């Protein structure tokens, strides 16, 4: 009922996540994809933007939501049980006004438990975000940056 263009798609085995502004979708088939049983469901309604580059470290996906200035990073946890999708919670609530603005890449390591956001608002700094997930419980989240000169 709302003409939503499709911007981002993050492939997972079993499910593909389609992310329109104001409407989010999951493409899960069961068995083979086989055209007939391809299926699609409207899971979440949170807002994504054109320049919100999503990079999914694991089950969860990080995407930067630009404000007027000083963007705030957002995290969405794609849960296999589509019943408990809830919404995408902010991870820079404790540290807003921090990332400069124009973000051109989000990189992380699942093994090393961090994701780095680097923005052309301030080219020098690499904004480290280190997390420690323990059985789906967020034990610690830390925001800091690396200045190379």
């Amino acid at each position: 009922n709302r003409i939503a263009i499709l911007k981002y798609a993050v492939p997972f085995s079993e499910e593909l996540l389609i992310w329109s502004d104001e409407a989010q979708f999951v493409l899960t088939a069961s068995g083979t994809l086989t055209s007939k049983s391809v299926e699609l469901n409207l899971t979440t309604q949170f807002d994504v933007q054109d320049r919100a580059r999503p990079f999914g470290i694991g089950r969860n996906v990080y995407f930067a939501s630009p404000r007027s200035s000083f963007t705030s990073i957002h995290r969405y946890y794609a849960v296999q049980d589509v019943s408990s999708v809830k919404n995408a919670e902010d991870i820079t609530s404790h540290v807003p006004n921090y990332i400069p603005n124009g973000v051109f890449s989000i990189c992380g390591s699942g093994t090393e438990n961090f994701c780095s956001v680097l923005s052309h608002g301030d080219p020098s700094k690499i904004f480290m975000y280190k997390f420690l997930y323990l059985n789906e419980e967020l034990r610690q989240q830390s925001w800091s940056h690396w200045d190379f000169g």
């Binding site: 009922n1 709302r2 003409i3 939503a4 263009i5 502004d21 104001e22």
Partner: protein
């Protein structure tokens, strides 16, 4: 944002229903007691023409009597007061003596 008009430009008690078709097309379907006005969220007024007449919108209290659903492109509108009526004199065959 832009002023819609005079104080009496809208109805005394209008029914206002926001329209969200697209990231680019977004509107407000405000129903005067008699007639419709439709403004963009930028404030610009997009003129409405009533082909096939109106007299469906005209209501003493449009707030209570109008029910609308905004599908992708256009909205269906029900006047609660108006009673649906079968169209007589539109029969398939007027008499058609079968034998």
């Amino acid at each position: 944002l832009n002023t819609l008009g005079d104080n009496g430009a809208l109805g005394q008690a209008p029914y206002i229903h926001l329209i969200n078709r697209d990231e680019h097309e977004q509107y407000y379907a405000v129903f005067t007691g008699s007639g419709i006005r439709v403004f963009d969220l930028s404030g610009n007024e997009k003129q409405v023409r009533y082909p096939n007449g109106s007299n469906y919108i005209k209501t003493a209290n449009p707030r209570n009597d109008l029910r609308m659903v905004t599908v992708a492109d256009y909205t269906f509108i029900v006047n609660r007061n108006v009673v649906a009526q079968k169209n007589t004199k539109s029969v398939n065959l007027p008499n058609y003596n079968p034998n």
